[PDB]
Amino acid sequence: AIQSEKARKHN
Amino acid sequence: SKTYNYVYSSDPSSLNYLAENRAATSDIVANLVDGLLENDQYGNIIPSLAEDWTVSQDGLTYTYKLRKDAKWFTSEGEEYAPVTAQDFVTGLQYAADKKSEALYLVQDSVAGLDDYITGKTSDFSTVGVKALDDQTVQYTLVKPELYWNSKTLATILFPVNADFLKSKGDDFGKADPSSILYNGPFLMKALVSKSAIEYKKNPNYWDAKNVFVDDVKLTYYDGSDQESLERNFTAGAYTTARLFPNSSSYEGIKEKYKNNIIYSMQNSTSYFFNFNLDRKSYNYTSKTSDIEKKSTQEAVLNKNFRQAINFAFDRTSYGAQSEGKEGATKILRNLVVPPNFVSIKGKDFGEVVASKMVNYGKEWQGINFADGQDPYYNPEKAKAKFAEAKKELEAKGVQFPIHLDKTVEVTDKVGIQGVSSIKQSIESVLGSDNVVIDIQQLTSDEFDSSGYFAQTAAQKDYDLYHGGWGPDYQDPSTYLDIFNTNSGGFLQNLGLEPGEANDKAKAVGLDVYTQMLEEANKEQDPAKRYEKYADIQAWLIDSSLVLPSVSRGGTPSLRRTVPFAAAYGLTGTKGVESYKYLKVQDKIVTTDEYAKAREKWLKEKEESNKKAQEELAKHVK
């Protein structure tokens, strides 16, 4: 699945 | 009751778990719809909707027995219909009929499905999914797949109720809680764009006894207030909080929570940079001429140019923008396939790939692909690669400097720093008279419409993209297939359309890469199959069509969740994405409490995975 880079800044 | 409160950042374009391949959809539906199997706390594949299963001695036929205390519910928790085997026939036919973006998961696996999708057949009765009775589903495969059961953790193999499909028509799967039926752990109570996502525990869920939060609220987080996460955790409003060592506050936070800062492990999600090889949209650019635009369209097709960027890209500097300079390397990922994703002959994937690099030139000599370090950054190697790139490009009429467009959300203050680190690094090594990274700060609508939520390659509006892949099943092909020209899930992010194989794709060798994937997939012995994909990953690294940057995990946080209570999965959507099995507590976990739990979990996991592989034989007919 395609993961957005954005999520890594709160994950 | 007990509540889990945190944030989210991606509104979904759709709830259509059968048609989408974007994490923005699967992350949510993981909590609302169950498939045949799921994960325990140790990564084992355990019963779900299916309470038992068998595989034939030739590995081609999988039969699943469904429990019958499983039902579909409306968004308000009212019972709609029992879950039945026909729902899996309906699901697969629907995904085929609507040309799902995740069809690569099943198109070349389910017998007769490729024939059905391409119109070579018209009768779904020839496709290898059958409802033998109401509780019995049977799949027939083209060839044996040891990773097949892991595929059932992906949403394209989730069931759907045909009568609800008929009754809803084109309204099915829209971004509205009422657009789908529910059989998973939660009901969705609120889905409000850029405001919140809210789950309520479904008390009539078949496995309600394993759901330990009654409410889950996710608040929208746009990146503009990074101190919001810690501030709300400390106030008792968030169950967890990711920390930002680069922040103003971290000095006080570090001392206040010196015994509570917890660092996660890097997981199987891999981020990488890629170029737009066929750019068609220039709404967001600093180029002012068509010689500049065409010069950039030329540079990204040249391998020496892509390698120069690869060697001029300082990953440590990039990671320090979000992790502080102490933890800058804790997130570095250097392949698309994680280095330990599979093991071959006792040596894992990253070592074998590092050995395959021996046939791709002098600039890869003795490379180390291990997590947590930067093997790529090498200024003088970058200067030598660019010198050759410039000689070759200038003979074509290419004008320098090469301008490269990179987008970023105007609210994402951490992301602005990371992208500025990349501009500073590359321009420092190659010179701003040779390359210029033009940073484009966009609204949320411009960012999504030109990137992640663009629906065509033509709409991609950038020269440089930073995206990532989450593994859908337990085989290296889940990562490496995404750039293949036939059905690559990531192709549009490269500016190419699957099934077109234009001359820009051939100019960079993606047709060759695609041919290698075909031959690698036919290999059924795991050791070779993996060694063949290692050679393919090596080819992709040398091509520098991707620049591996970072993984998920490896980040600091404060926690009020119980350590190692939630499910875990190397691949799929039923691991960390699910709020099942997760437990919250009053006390802030201490670093030492987490470390003791990690040690206990690591030992329980080795024993559990051992007994799980031993149990597998019981299931063979």
Numbering used by the authors:
A (entry chain B): 1 to 11
B (entry chain A): 32 to 652
Paper text:
The system comprises five exposed Oligopeptide Binding Proteins (OBPs) and four proteins building the ABC transporter channel. Crucially, SBPs determine the specificity of their respective transport systems, thereby governing the range of molecules capable of entering the cell.
To evaluate AliB’s capacity to recognize diverse peptides, the protein was incubated with an excess of defined synthesized peptides (peptides 2, 3 and 4) that were previously reported to bind AliB. Specifically, crystal structures of AliB in complex with peptide 2 (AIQSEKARKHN), peptide 3 (PIVGGHEGAGV), and peptide 4 (VMVKGPGPGREST) were solved at resolutions of 2.29 Å, 1.66 Å and 1.49 Å, respectively. The three complexes obtained for AliB exhibited minimal backbone changes among them (rmsd ranging between 0.1 and 0.3 Å). In all three complexes, mirroring the observation in the AliD:peptide 1 complex, the amine N-terminus of the oligopeptide establishes a salt-bridge with an aspartic residue (D503) and van der Waals interactions with the neighboring tryptophan residue (W500). The region encompassing the first three residues of the ligands (AIQ in peptide 2, PIV in peptide 3 and VMV in peptide 4) folds in an antiparallel β-sheet-fashion with the β20 (G499, W500 and G501) from Lobe 1, and parallel β-sheet-like interactions with a loop of domain I (containing residues N52 and A54) on the opposite side. For instance, in the case of peptide 2, the remaining portion of the oligopeptide immediately following the small β strand region, which exhibits a strong basic character (EKARKHN), adopts an α-helix conformation within the AliB cavity. This helical region finds stabilization through numerous H-bonds with the protein and is further reinforced by salt-bridge interactions involving the basic residues of the substrate interacting with the acidic residues of the protein (E351, E437, and D443). Regardless, the electrostatic potential of the AliB binding site exhibits a neutral character to facilitate interaction with the residue at position 2 through Van der Waals interactions, and a strongly acidic character after position 4, enabling the stabilization of basic residues of the oligopeptides through salt-bridge interactions.
